[PDB]
């Protein structure tokens, strides 16, 4: 059937099981992320098979000649394409699904949150396999964003002028 349950498209690839990714594409209704732009930090996420029977995406960012490590556990949420991770807390679970993965040089990711007091938070991510992103590739997020009824104020590409490895 149509509508009701089709916000994300199913597509499981061998690479999805494990691969290196860059924390590209950022979109938020609020201005929380913007307040973080003043610091400018980029984290590289990599999901590797864990002993728990799942994958573990570790995001590592380098900000101001400083690199930090972040470990995240992702487990299957039933049907393929949908996965969720149990964030450290008294019962906080964030559900994240991947709309579609391009076989060119980019990937579309969509994040959703409860927003503190169940304010239903909406997050959109545009990861880039390359070091950066093209306004062209940015164009895909713009057309879709404008099509949905959102301005550029909601979408922004976080810069990564540091590279924890490359230099």
UniProtKB/Swiss-Prot annotation:
Stretches assigned to coiled coil: none
Highest taxon listed in the record's lineage: Eukaryota
Gene Ontology process terms (BP): gene expression; mast cell degranulation; negative regulation of male germ cell proliferation; prostaglandin biosynthetic process; regulation of circadian sleep/wake cycle, sleep; response to glucocorticoid
KO phenotype (gene knockout): Mutant mice show decreased susceptibility to passive cutaneous anaphylaxis associated with decreased mast cell degranulation.
Compartments where located: Rough endoplasmic reticulum; Nucleus membrane; Golgi apparatus; Cytoplasm, Perinuclear region
Induction: By IL-1 beta and thyroid hormone. Probably induced by dexamethasone, dihydrotestosterone, progesterone, retinoic acid and retinal. Repressed by the Notch-Hes signaling pathway.
Positions of modified residues (Pyrrolidone carboxylic acid): 3
UniProt-recorded Gene Ontology molecular function terms: fatty acid binding; prostaglandin-D synthase activity; retinoid binding
Any Pfam family matching the protein: Lipocalin
Mitochondrion as UniProt keyword: no
Residues annotated as catalytic: 43
Function: Catalyzes the conversion of PGH2 to PGD2, a prostaglandin involved in smooth muscle contraction/relaxation and a potent inhibitor of platelet aggregation. Involved in a variety of CNS functions, such as sedation, NREM sleep and PGE2-induced allodynia, and may have an anti-apoptotic role in oligodendrocytes. Binds small non-substrate lipophilic molecules, including biliverdin, bilirubin, retinal, retinoic acid and thyroid hormone, and may act as a scavenger for harmful hydrophobic molecules and as a secretory retinoid and thyroid hormone transporter.
Family stated for the protein in its record: Belongs to the calycin superfamily. Lipocalin family.
Oligomeric form and interacting partners: Monomer.
Protein's name in the database: Prostaglandin-H2 D-isomerase
